Amino acid sequence: VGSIVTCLDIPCSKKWVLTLAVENGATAASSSVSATQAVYGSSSANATVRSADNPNTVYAFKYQVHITLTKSRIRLDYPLYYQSDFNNKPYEIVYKYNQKGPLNWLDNQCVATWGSSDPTCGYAYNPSWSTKPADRILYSQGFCCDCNAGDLLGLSPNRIRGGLDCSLLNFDNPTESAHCLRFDSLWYSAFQIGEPDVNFVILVNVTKCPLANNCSTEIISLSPSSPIGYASNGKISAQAIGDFAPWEGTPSYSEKLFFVPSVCTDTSEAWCVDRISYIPTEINRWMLIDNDLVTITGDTCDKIGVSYSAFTNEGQRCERPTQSCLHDQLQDYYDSDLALEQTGKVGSYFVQFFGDFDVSGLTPRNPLLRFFTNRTQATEVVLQFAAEELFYTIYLAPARFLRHLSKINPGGLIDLWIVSEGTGQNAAQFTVSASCEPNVEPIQAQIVTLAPGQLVSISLPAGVCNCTLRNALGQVLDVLVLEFN
Ligand SMILES: *[C@@H]1O[C@H](CO)[C@@H](O[C@@H]2O[C@H](CO)[C@@H](O[C@@H]3O[C@H](CO)[C@@H](O)[C@H](O[C@@H]4O[C@H](CO)[C@@H](O)[C@H](O[C@H]5O[C@H](CO)[C@@H](O)[C@H](O)[C@@H]5O)[C@@H]4O)[C@@H]3O)[C@H](O)[C@H]2NC(C)=O)[C@H](O)[C@H]1NC(C)=O
Ligand SMILES: *[C@@H]1O[C@H](CO)[C@@H](O)[C@H](O)[C@H]1NC(C)=O
């Protein structure tokens, strides 16, 4: 049980403070109880609460109080920091014709020199919707391959990427090829990951019921981010207490990037609309991928985010097969883990393979990285109650029998004098009992009310009388023995 404090300079004049602990657990059908629950003001002994200062006052429950605390599973929430967006699978297209016919060195050359208004691949622009030549993206026009001798050794070595037949002397036969970088419809958003925060929910049910010798219910929710809640017009407050910091050994994903599918540039591709659908089977296919598998600058080949500079500047580009520089993309990680998921094995990139990923309440374009855990831990919950309506005051003053005045005259009439000593204006109720034993009919006790400093006399109708003074609540103050007859 808790004590009662005066409300120092949380709205109250007097305040009941109680501290409880609640712990979470995996209950089952058989053992279904993890709750912390306590009742107050129901038994005849726990009906009063000691005061912090001035013990002469105790507070009795006006209602019987039911408080129940339950704790959710413990979740690790990883803060996300937006990096940029990344294409799912870039692909190379090869052009060997244009609107004039086959590409060749004589009458219809492949054009990819920077600055030309005539690139066979076209340019890309930044912003993408622009056609201003000043907004052309460097290296976006791709590059040409032809039936010449490159700087390195060989005879017509640049024919390989475009599949050119450098032996036919024929104007229907193209002798040059253009190579352009393109991005498929699906774009992922990538996030950096911070160190996790702990999260849980504590439900506090406070139920007031009448005394017995209708019920009311208020629910307070508590969390590490919102640790203080109120109820019944600020008359009640609950607060979770402790170091909510993550523990040692919690998994860290700092070196990784959170890859969330976000955008379809061509919404007419049903496969793309599926990849961004916020349903649990696809959200569990979002990916954590090591940062060193990504190129944020796009000038590194065979890395997530590869772009025009890496594609065009690859050494001996024309001697390489198509789609070179474009390996190991998000689509390849997806297919790799998808086949593992489709065969009951454990992959390396899907979030479902990292733990109990929370898919609830996720809104598109506002993703989160949250994992439920094994953890069970106790959390102290401090409760405060405005005592104005929960308790009425009960005062306890000292009280003596005035021995120099309380006598017995020789008919049974006991003249008793009681004094309450001290200062105060709050009366206290006292019970006076008499136990005259030898052949004396019973004497009924009587309640007397005395404020500090007051003094009253009451008469009670070979013997001896045991007279006892009792407090308003389960105490005895003074006892005097007096002879009779
Ligand atoms: C906040 O906290 C307070 C108290 O801490 C809660 O109030 C308490 O709610 C309890 C249930 O909600 C309630 O206990 C009930 O007592 C009733 C009898 O007085 C029961 O009818 C009631 O439901 C039963 O529970 C049984 C458990 O299995 C169940 O078997 C039973 O169903 C069988 O029995 C009926 C016949 O009664 C058949 O018709 C039926 O077909 C089944 O055979 C039934 O479900 C439960 O036992 C407490 O009395 C409440 N205490 C107080 C002080 O009010 C609040 O609910 C909490 N608030 C919130 C929001 O959580
Ligand atoms: C929880 O921990 C226990 C041992 O402490 C382990 O056996 C169990 O597999 C764990 N479960 C989960 C879901 O982490």
Residue numbers in the entry: 37 to 45, 52 to 255, 274 to 470, 477 to 527, 537 to 560
Wording from the paper:
The protein HAP2/GCS1 (here called HAP2) is a gamete fusogen that is found in a wide range of eukaryotes including protists, algae, plants, insects, and hemichordates, and may be the “Eve” that enabled sex to evolve in early eukaryotes. Remarkably, HAP2 is structurally related to fusogens present in the membrane of enveloped viruses that allow them to fuse with and infect host cells. Although their sequences are highly divergent, HAP2 and viral class II fusogens have a common overall fold and domain arrangement. Here, we study the gamete fusogen HAP2 from Cyanidioschyzon merolae (Cyani), an extremophile red algae that grows at acidic pH at 45 °C. HAP2 has a trimeric postfusion structure with similarity to viral class II fusion proteins, but its prefusion structure has been elusive.
The Cyani HAP2 ectodomain (aa 28–564) was expressed in Drosophila S2 cells. A crystal structure of Cyani HAP2 to 2.3 Å resolution was solved by molecular replacement with the Chlamy postfusion HAP2 structure, and was refined to Rwork and Rfree values of 22.3 and 26.2%, respectively. Cyani HAP2 crystallizes as a monomer and has a rod-like shape with D3 in line with D2 and D1. It is much more extended than Chlamy HAP2, in which D3 folds back over D2 and D1 in the trimeric, postfusion state. Multi-angle light scattering (MALS) showed that Cyani HAP2 was monomeric in solution. PISA assembly analysis of the Cyani HAP2 crystal structure showed that no significant interactions with other monomers were present in the crystal lattice and thus that Cyani HAP2 was monomeric at high concentrations in crystals as well as in solution. The fusion loops of Cyani HAP2 locate to the membrane distal end of D2. Surprisingly, a β-sheet with three β-strands is present in D1 that is absent in the postfusion state of HAP2; we therefore term it the interim β-sheet. Although the interim β-sheet locates to the boundary of D1 with D3, it shares two backbone hydrogen bonds and an extensive hydrophobic interface with other residues in D1 and is therefore part of D1. Switching of the J0 β-strand from the interim β-sheet to the D1 β-sandwich in the postfusion state dictates a large change in orientation and position of D3 of HAP2, as the J0 β-strand leads directly into D3.
